[PDB]
């Protein structure tokens, strides 16, 4: 569910990234490290018609703290913004059978490559590589039903 937000971050118009940087620079008005700590996220949340706790405040900082410095910087702030802007499990099961062509109950690399070529789009050696090691989260050359669910989180 993570690398679905970085895509939305990547496809932000530079006119959207401008408004966010502008709104981010008001956010951090008067912070030492120039970043959203708990004071900054505190004010703008309680003044946004809310009132979260100091503990509950950090779990929004740490939900997008890919730095660990308790402060949401601008790049983490874009991920925080796109997080608040999929496919049902019962429906993903019906499609899991379409991949598993030999009907064994797993999705090996060959079944993935056949679907990729059937997309009509030009597949590369590196598209196939990154996708398989993204879905196969224990490196057994195959994607069982439980991983395929994690693989298709939020995919339209």
């Amino acid at each position: 569910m993570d690398d679905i937000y970085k895509a939305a971050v990547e496809q932000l118009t530079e006119e959207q990234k401008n408004e966010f940087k502008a709104a981010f620079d008001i956010f951090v008005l008067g912070a030492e490290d120039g970043s959203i700590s708990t004071k900054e996220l505190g004010k703008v949340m309680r003044m946004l018609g809310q009132n979260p706790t100091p503990e509950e405040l950090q779990e929004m900082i740490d939900e997008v703290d890919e730095d660990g410095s308790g402060t949401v910087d601008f790049d983490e702030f874009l991920v925080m913004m796109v997080r608040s802007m999929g496919k049902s499990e019962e429906e993903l099961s019906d499609l899991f059978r379409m991949f598993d062509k030999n009907a064994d109950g797993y999705i090996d690399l060959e079944e993935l490559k056949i679907m990729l070529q059937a997309t009509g789009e030009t597949i590369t050696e590196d598209d196939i590589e990154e996708l398989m090691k993204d879905g196969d989260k224990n490196n057994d050359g195959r994607i069982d039903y439980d991983e395929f669910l994690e693989f298709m989180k939020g995919v339209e």
Binding site: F96, A103, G105, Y106, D144, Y145, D146
Partner: protein, 67 residues
């Protein structure tokens, strides 16, 4: 000579062996309609049985690997 066998075959006689040739016309029709509809239910029940053997097998794979 079975009691439940003689009575079973009598269901035809009580329902068919007694009346009109013009009603037998429009009664043999509805008798085929019932078979076709049941033959359709039997096709779909067979197809769902195929899909469940896949559903069950995928579960047997998951229950094993997740242990």
């Amino acid at each position: 000579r079975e009691k439940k066998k003689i009575l079973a075959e009598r269901r035809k006689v009580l329902a068919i062996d007694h009346l009109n040739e013009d009603q037998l016309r429009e009664k043999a029709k509805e008798l085929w309609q019932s078979i076709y509809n049941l033959e359709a239910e039997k096709f779909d029940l067979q197809e769902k049985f195929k899909q469940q053997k896949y559903e069950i097998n995928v579960l047997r794979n998951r229950i094993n690997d997740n242990q």
